[PDB]
Amino acid sequence: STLPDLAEQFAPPDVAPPLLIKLVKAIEKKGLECSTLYRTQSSSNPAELRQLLDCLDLEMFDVHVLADAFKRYLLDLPNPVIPVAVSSELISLAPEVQSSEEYIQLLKKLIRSPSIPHQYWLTLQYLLKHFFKLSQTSSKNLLNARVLSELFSPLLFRFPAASSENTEHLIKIIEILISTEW
Amino acid sequence: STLPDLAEQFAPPDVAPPLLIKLVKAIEKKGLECSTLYRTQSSSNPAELRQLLDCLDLEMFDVHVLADAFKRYLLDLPNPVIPVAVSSELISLAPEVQSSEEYIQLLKKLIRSPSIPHQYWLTLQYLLKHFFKLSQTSSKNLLNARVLSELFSPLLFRFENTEHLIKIIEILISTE
Would you indicate the residue range of the signal peptide (chain A)? Predict the structure, then answer.
C-alpha cells in the first residue's frame, strides 16, 4: 500500500502518472487485440504485482501480468481515481434526476472541484482514452464500452454498494464516457 | 484568480512550485538588504500583480512589486500553504496546550498527513528556508523571525486565538 497519491505522482503539464503511462503503452503494444485482456487472472499474486510497480522496460513482462498490475495499480492508489467525495454524491441522487447527461454533468463538476486536485480528473480522462482505444478493436478483443465499464467501474469508484438504479447509473456514465472520447 | 492548487503546480521530485522559486530567487537577489522588504505597499493593484503571476525575467521588475506579488501568490492559492484542517486543529487546542515544541511537532504531523498532498509541506519548507535566509541579514532588512512570522503567518494559515500559531512560525524560521 506504498503507492503515492495520484496528486503526488505527477502534476500538469503532464497528463497522467508516468507509471500509468508505461503500463498503458505496454498493454496497448502487446495486448490490444487480446480477446481475454483484463478478463483472465495471471499467476502473479498482489505482492509480486506490487513488486513490479517499483523497479526495467514493462514490455518485457507477460501481457497478462501487465494487465493484472494495471488493476493492482488502481486498487493500491490511496484514494481511488474517482474520489469517495464524488461517488458519495452521485449515489445520493434521486430517481427524478435520472438523465445520464445530468449524472455526467455532476461527475465533471464534482471531480473538477478545486477541493480535488486536477490529477484525479486528468487520470480518469487518460484511462477513458485507453478504454476507448480498446473498444475500437472490439471485433478482435471482444471489449465494448459497457463491459469495460462493468470491469473497471469497481476499480475506479472503489465503492461497496448494493446494485441500485444509482449504481447502474454510475456504470452507465462510465460506459458513456468511454464511448464518447472522440 | 486562476492560480492552481499547490498540488497542481508541481509534484515530487521537484521541491517547490516553479513560480514560487522564480519569485524567491528574484526577491533574494534584489532585496536581501532592503530595510522595507515585504512591509511596503507598492503601487500595483491585485489585478496587475495577478497579471505578473499569470506570466519574463522577474529581475526586470521593481523589488517592491515582486514582494507584493509574493504576497498575492500566497493569498490567491485556492488552499492556503497550511491547510485549514491543520490550522483549525492547532487553534482548537489553544487553551489546553501551550508547549510550543508540542505545537511544532503537531503542525508537522498534521501537515504530513497522507490525506494532504506532500506539496503543502514541501512548499512550507521552501518558504521557511527563504524566511530564514532573510533573517540572516536582519541587521540590514530588519526582518527577524518574529517580524517575518507576524507578516506571513496570516498568509500561511489564512486567518488572540492565533498567537500560538505566530510563535510556531517564529520558531520554525529560527531553527532552519
Answer: none
